[PDB]
């Protein structure tokens, strides 16, 4: 009879390897174009006829309809990498594929899959030892801060304002970074004017609902509410006794509760997301007051500035100037929703990168430089490690050659030529030597500015490696239909 039931697609040994590897390659190359300032975005439209124009690989994979087992593993690699530091989302993808590609070629020759993993796993630990030694430690310091932020802003659609997005993110992550947290950063996408209008507000912005209320309150006594203001006098009256000139309700507010809050000169705001309430409690010091009867004067947070700005022609309350504002708000501005989307996508990344600094100062000269170095080192390492592993180790490194290869790829520069040249000049110019796309030729990344985070690379190698290895072991899997 049938070894397995019906509707169960199976694959054993190489048969599976080819499929898994192949699927991963096309998926790794698809996003490969989204690397460097030559990153060619893509337009994915789900069932709901929604158009998504993003350059971030993770955003792409998490929006693409993937049903292939091994292929899904790539979506995980990009997911974790995006959750770790954000930058290098595509790095892991492509690399992961190259590995499998070099490995598969080893099997077809007669090499045991076992040795493959061992060789690759052993080289994964060697690299994690080379990177920390070669890395270029940088100096906090607004001077060094802008340097890394300036190298994380490029390669995107907002490259025209890489100087503005640099200072904007440099100010925010430098007002409350105790141990910095990317969650204390609220970005807002307001349409109107070019991105060269983006501002940095020291606080949290939102949208009020009452007019007759105080549009611009001085030292406000914020009172975060969550319970609806529907019935309305005793509820709004108990808020005027505490001295709350600013009401931030979580749910809806009754029209009679608004007119009363409008008569008490108390600026009321209804329909406030649950996260905006929490962010307002850790910025001004307000207490999440459930009911409208227990609020007092010790539950009111202080906000020196709570005015109503109509930037871009849309009303927005700016709760800035507080005692210990632990959460700032990035006021983005865009001429189109498209540009506004891309910009924000990159802003977050920089937020994570900065978060990497607060927990890792080290940085490496990106642009393929580090890759080539590791390839060089690892290769030599393989020659120092006898056994069939010498082949696997060298093959692993040969994979890193896919990163700069993609670089000259999305630029139309013959990889065969640029690579050979890169290595040569790299074996003499050391680490710093990289590839400058803007000008097809070798160049010192450290001087060009292009510097990536050490930790950013670290995880990448590990995550990608371990992941790829897994997909290679499971060489036999039917299903259970």
């Amino acid at each position: 009879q049938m070894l397995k039931e019906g509707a169960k697609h199976f694959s054993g040994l190489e048969e599976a390897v080819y499929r898994n590897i192949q699927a991963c390659k096309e998926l790794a190359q698809t996003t490969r174009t989204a690397y460097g300032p030559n990153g060619m975005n893509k337009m994915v439209i789900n069932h709901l006829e929604k158009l998504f124009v993003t350059n971030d690989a993770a955003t792409i994979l998490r929006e693409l309809e993937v049903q292939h087992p091994a292929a899904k593993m790539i979506v995980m690699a990009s997911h974790m990498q995006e959750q770790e530091v954000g930058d290098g989302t595509n790095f892991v993808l492509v690399f992961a594929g190259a590995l499998l590609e070099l490995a598969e070629e080893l099997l077809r020759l007669g090499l045991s899959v076992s040795e493959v993993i061992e060789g690759y796993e052993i080289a994964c630990k060697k690299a994690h030892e080379i990177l920390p030694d070669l890395v270029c430690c940088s100096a906090r310091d607004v001077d060094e801060v802008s340097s890394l932020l300036h190298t994380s802003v490029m390669s995107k659609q907002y490259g025209n304002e890489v100087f503005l997005a640099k200072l904007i993110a440099q100010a925010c992550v430098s007002i409350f970074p105790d141990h910095f947290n990317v969650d204390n950063i609220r970005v807002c996408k307001i349409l109107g004017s070019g991105v060269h209008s983006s501002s940095v507000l020291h606080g949290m912005v939102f949208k009020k609902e009452t007019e007759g209320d105080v549009t611009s309150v001085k030292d406000a006594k914020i009172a975060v509410y969550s319970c609806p203001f529907d019935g309305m006098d005793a509820q709004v009256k108990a808020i005027a006794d505490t001295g709350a000139n600013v009401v931030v309700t979580g749910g809806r507010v009754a029209d009679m509760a608004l007119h009363y809050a409008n008569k008490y000169n108390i600026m009321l705001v209804r329909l406030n997301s649950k996260w905006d309430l929490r962010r307002l409690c850790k910025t001004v010091g307000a207490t999440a007051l459930p009911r409208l009867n227990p609020p007092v004067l010790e539950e009111m947070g202080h906000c020196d500035s709570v005015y109503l700005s109509e930037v871009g022609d849309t009303q927005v309350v700016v709760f800035k100037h507080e005692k210990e504002g632990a959460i700032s708000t990035i006021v983005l501005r865009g001429s189109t929703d498209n540009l506004m989307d891309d910009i924000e996508r990159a802003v977050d990344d920089g937020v994570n990168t900065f978060k990497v600094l607060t927990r890792d100062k080290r940085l490496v000269p990106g642009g393929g430089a580090t890759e080539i170095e590791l390839a060089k080192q690892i290769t030599s390492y393989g020659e120092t490690c006898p056994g069939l592993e010498q082949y696997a180790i060298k093959k692993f490194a040969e994979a890193f050659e896919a990163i700069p290869r993609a670089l000259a790829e999305n630029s139309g520069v013959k990889a065969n030529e640029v690579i050979s040249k890169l290595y040569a000049v790299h074996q003499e110019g050391n680490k710093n030597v990289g590839l400058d796309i803007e000008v097809p030729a070798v160049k010192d990344m450290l001087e060009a500015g292009v510097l990536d985070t050490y930790l950013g690379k670290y995880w990448a190698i590990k995550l990608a490696t371990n992941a790829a290895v897994t997909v290679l072991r499971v060489d036999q899997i039917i299903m259970a239909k």
Binding site: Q1, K4, E5, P69, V113, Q476, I478, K481
Partner: protein, 481 residues
């Protein structure tokens, strides 16, 4: 003839035997890909898109929609091999499969099935009796236990931290042996951090609901309560009078009841799994009364140190130092949840491995070391039985040699070649000769620590012969009514 109902497949003559043999053989080869330290786990995805990724054979054969009536039987064999013993579940499937192969060889030659059965059966008994002569006698020795438990953890994921987990297994098993009971070792898995933080608590580990309830009770008297504490203060008054400092309730606690409990300095938890309640009464010696008014100062369990420490941003309630040091908890700290899934299975087998090691001072050289032995023995036992029976024994011995072959298989080395070396070295060194893949040559399994429990090998031949042969009798199933 119409003895059957429309749509009734019928196996007849050699046809049945053929389909059956190939059947059991096929599934036997598919599962043969995950045997050994170089094995490869399989990812089975049922209908709901579920994704079961494990290495254990039984589980796999329990998720794969088998349509082969024979394979289905091979699934019942791996089951009786996991319920009675556990580890090696795979080994069995291969034996029975390879066994049928040797037989068929004979059947196609003209040999009648019956005579063949007697041949194998004649070898079985002798085989089981040989395992009684080749069993290594040790004792509750902590050293040998560490070796076995360690070798068990190997060939899997945790093979990275076998040394640590193994140690915890030996201790937990040493404190739960009266006659070992695994139900006394609570396996609690938690995410966050690495799997190198796993510790061994000697009490209970629940995964103060109110922010005013003590976070650490000394001589905490547990007042187990099953009923709900909702529709209140009168129920809290009855607890304080019964001297219950730690009321672990199985149902939710009314918000108002928590305020009256915390006001008295009472540490009460809510929504506790029924299985955790029974473990709290058998460790601290407490009585779980249904109604809140059935509790009394004589139903309070004696605890030594009940603290609530964070096991990854999640505060867990540790109720260790119980009056009965016979109830230990094996906390599992590791990366993702999926990882702990496999690991938890590793310990389940590690505890069982050590369990049988102490309950049975048997410890034969695994890694095929025993296989080859028995094989050569039968080869010299067949000339003393002669007749077509000689063949049976021989075939049974040749079928036993599948284990070492598969070893050289999953490793990559030459199956046949290695077999010759191991066999030539086994008849020169003794029963301590095994197939060490890490060295690519036959070594003393008893010197590398590679040891297996007698129960395994013994039980193996048993479940194999019986079923296997029975599959040679059933030459027709016919689905009718």
């Amino acid at each position: 003839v119409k003895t059957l109902n429309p749509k009734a497949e019928v196996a007849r003559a050699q046809a049945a035997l053929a389909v059956n043999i190939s059947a059991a053989r096929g599934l036997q080869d598919v599962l043969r890909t995950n045997l050994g330290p170089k094995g490869t786990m399989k990812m089975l995805v049922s209908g709901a898109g579920d994704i079961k990724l494990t290495k254990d054979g039984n589980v796999l054969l329990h998720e794969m929609q088998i349509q082969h009536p024979t394979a289905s039987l091979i699934a019942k064999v791996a089951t009786a091999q996991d319920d009675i013993t556990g580890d090696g579940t795979t080994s069995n499937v291969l034996i029975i499969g390879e066994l049928l192969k040797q037989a068929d060889l004979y059947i196609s030659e003209g040999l009648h099935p019956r005579i063949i059965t007697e041949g194998f059966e004649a070898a079985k008994e002798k085989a089981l009796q040989f395992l009684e002569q080749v069993k290594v006698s040790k004792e509750m020795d902590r050293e040998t236990l560490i070796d076995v438990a360690r070798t068990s953890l190997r060939t899997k994921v945790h093979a990275e931290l076998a040394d640590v987990l193994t140690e915890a297994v030996v201790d937990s098993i040493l404190a739960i042996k009266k006659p070992i009971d695994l139900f006394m070792v609570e396996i609690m898995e938690m995410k966050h951090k690495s799997e190198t933080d796993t510790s061994l608590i000697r009490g209970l580990v629940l995964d103060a609901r109110h922010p005013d309830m003590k976070k650490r009770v000394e001589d905490a008297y547990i007042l187990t309560c099953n009923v709900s504490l909702e529709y209140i203060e009168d129920r809290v008054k009855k607890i304080i009078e019964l001297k219950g400092f730690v009321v672990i309730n199985q149902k939710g606690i009314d918000p108002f009841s928590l305020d009256a409990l915390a006001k008295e300095g009472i540490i009460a938890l809510r929504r506790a799994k029924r299985r955790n309640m029974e473990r709290l009464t058998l460790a601290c010696g407490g009585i779980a009364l249904n109604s809140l008014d059935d509790l009394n100062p004589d139903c309070l369990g004696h605890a030594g140190l009940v603290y609530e420490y964070t096991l990854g941003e999640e505060k867990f309630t540790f109720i260790e130092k119980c009056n009965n040091p016979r109830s230990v908890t094996l906390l599992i700290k590791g990366p993702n949840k999926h990882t702990l899934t496999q690991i938890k299975d590793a310990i389940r087998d590690g505890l069982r491995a050590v369990k049988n090691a102490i309950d049975d001072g048997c410890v034969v050289p695994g890694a095929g070391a025993v296989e080859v032995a028995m094989a050569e023995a039968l080869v010299k036992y067949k000339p003393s039985v002669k007749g077509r029976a000689q063949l049976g024994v021989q075939a049974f011995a040749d079928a036993l040699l599948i284990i070492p072959k598969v070893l050289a298989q999953n490793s990559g080395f030459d199956l046949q070649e290695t077999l010759v070396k191991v066999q030539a070295e086994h008849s020169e060194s003794g029963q301590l000769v095994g197939v060490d893949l890490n060295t690519g040559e036959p070594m003393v399994a008893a010197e590398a620590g590679i040891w297996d429990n007698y129960c395994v090998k013994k039980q193996l031949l048993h479940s194999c012969t019986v079923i296997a042969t029975n599959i040679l009798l059933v030459d027709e199933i016919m689905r009718a009514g």
